Amino acid sequence: TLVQRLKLILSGGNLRCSDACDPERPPTRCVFQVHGQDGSNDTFPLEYVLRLMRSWAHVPCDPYVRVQNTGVSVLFQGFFFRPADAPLAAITAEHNNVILASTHSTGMSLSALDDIKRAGGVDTRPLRAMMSVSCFVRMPRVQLSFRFMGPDDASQTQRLLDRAELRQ
Amino acid sequence: TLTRAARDRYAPYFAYAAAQPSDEVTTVRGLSNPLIKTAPVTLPFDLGQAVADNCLSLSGMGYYLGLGGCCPTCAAAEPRLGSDRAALVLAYVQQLNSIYEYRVFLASVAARDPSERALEEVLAHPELFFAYYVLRDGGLRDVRVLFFEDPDAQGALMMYVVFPEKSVHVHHRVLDRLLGACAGHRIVAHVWQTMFVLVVRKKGDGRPADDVPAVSASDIYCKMRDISFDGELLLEYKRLYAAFEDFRPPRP
Numbered sequence: 056t057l058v059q060r061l062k063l064i065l066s067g068g069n070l071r072c073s074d075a076c077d078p079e080r081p082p083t084r085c086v087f088q089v090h091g092q093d094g095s096n097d098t099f100p101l102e103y104v105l106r107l108m109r110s111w112a113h114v115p116c117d118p119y120v121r122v123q124n125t126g127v128s129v130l131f132q133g134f135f136f137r138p139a140d141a142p143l144a145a146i147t148a149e150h151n152n153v154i155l156a157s158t159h160s161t162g163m164s165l166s167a168l169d170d171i172k173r174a175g176g177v178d179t180r181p182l183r184a185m186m187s188v189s190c191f192v193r194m195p196r197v198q199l200s201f202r203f204m205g206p207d208d209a210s211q212t213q214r215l216l217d218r219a220e221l222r223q
Numbered sequence: 224t225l226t227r228a229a230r231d232r233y234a235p236y237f238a239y240a241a242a243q244p245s246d247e248v249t250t251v252r253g254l255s256n257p258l259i260k261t262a263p264v265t266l267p268f269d270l271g272q273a274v275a276d277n278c279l280s281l282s283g284m285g286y287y288l289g290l291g292g293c294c295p296t297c298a299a300a301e302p303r304l305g306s307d308r309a310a311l312v313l314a315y316v317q318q319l320n321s322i323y324e325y326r327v328f329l330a331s332v333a334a335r336d337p338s339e340r341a342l343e344e345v346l347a348h349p350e351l352f353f354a355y356y357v358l359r360d361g362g363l364r365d366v367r368v369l370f371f372e373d374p375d376a377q378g379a380l381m382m383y384v385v386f387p388e389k390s391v392h393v394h395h396r397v398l399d400r401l402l403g404a405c406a407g408h409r410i411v412a413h414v415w416q417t418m419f420v421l422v423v424r425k426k427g428d429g430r431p432a433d434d435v436p437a438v439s440a441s442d443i444y445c446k447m448r449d450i451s452f453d454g455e456l457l458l459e460y461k462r463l464y465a466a467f468e469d470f471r472p473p474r475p
């Protein structure tokens with residue numbers, strides 16, 4: 056179901072997700088892979104996916120996504136828990152550009168994302184400011200920019216939030 | 224849990240999104256407004272830190288890295304810009320006939336060292352000419368160029384790109400083309416005696432010049448013998464070389 060949701064989310068863009076994990080015991084292994092080939096420009100709704108993954112689980116967890124330069128393409132790997140092997144992005148809200156050389160990786164955990172968010176003074180209200188990854192694949196390099204994105208019409212967002220609240 | 228947890232605030236929306244796919248799509252696609260459109264940077268600034276859609280701004284207001292999509296100047300320059308790298312190579316090789324369009328580029332070397340060997344040394348690194356051509360074709364017409372030897376490298380050549388005005392703007396298309404073309408070199412923004420200058424110097428492994436066909440040196444000299452330079456441009460280049468003589472860029 057998570058793969059279906061993710062493809063539905065990425066239907067806007069051209070990124071390709073690779074094709075049944077369970078909530079009470081969430082997997083430490085990779086749960087999804089997203090691929091973007093050379094010359095492509097596409098955005099990845101990072102924070103949205105993280106928050107979605109954390110919603111999916113019914114136990115405390117720290118969702119993490121890794122971005123790698125395969126050397127032919129860009130790869131996104133999804134985790135419910137940040138691996139010991141997993142790298143982190145040395146970025147701030149103001150300066151958020153990361154250049155990946157071949158076989159090199161970066162990463163973002165939801166917790167440290169929250170730390171960056173608070174440090175930046177970024178609005179924490181839901182769906183008011185979501186960190187996304189602007190991804191330009193340009194071999195031998197992968198260009199990343201972790202930019203906070205806001206809604207086109209906030210009013211519409213609140214209405215939607217209100218409805219959602221009524222459901223519960 | 225001690226503090227209403229993440230998704231606690233985000234829980235209703237996500238349940239609703241599980242219920243409503245279309246609304247989810249609308250929501251995720253709706254997040255298209257960047258909160259930070261420009262960010263200040265400090266010199267010396269390595270242009271390699273900029274992604275494809277980033278533009279650069281240099282002025283008395285400071286130095287900024289901006290989002291090209293949200294840029295008015297970029298928007299203004301946007302219609303006339305379309306890339307032809309193989310064409311860059313073609314222009315380099317067939318420059319001999321079309322010397323006229325690139326006069327200033329030659330004038331510089333002609334100003335510093337009219338010898339054939341000097342012009343040969345300049346022609347040894349084509350990516351410099353790639354830089355000049357990309358910058359000129361990008362609307363930065365009145366750019367001037369300087370050539371120095373690299374002190375922090377063995378037998379390597381450095382090229383200074385000096386801008387005429389006190390306000391400079393490098394389009395994201397032009398910047399991307401520039402970084403793409405000069406894959407063998409590094410380009411760093413600097414300021415020297417109130418003059419904004421892009422420093423292009425060779426980096427790392429391999430010599431890129433081996434991967435481009437050789438070009439006639441004595442023939443370009445022969446052609447140059449006929450050519451009539453402005454003469455004010457040459458003296459301009461004399462004082463420019465004099466001014467940047469004590470200029471010392473940092474280690475790579």
Ligand SMILES: [Cl-]
Pocket residue numbers: 147150
């Ligand atoms: Cl920074």
Ligand SMILES: [Cl-]
Pocket residue numbers: 267411422424472473
């Ligand atoms: Cl430098």
Ligand SMILES: [Cl-]
Pocket residue numbers: 266267413414472473
């Ligand atoms: Cl400097």
Ligand SMILES: [Zn+2]
Pocket residue numbers: 278279289290291294295296297392393394395
């Ligand atoms: Zn701009």
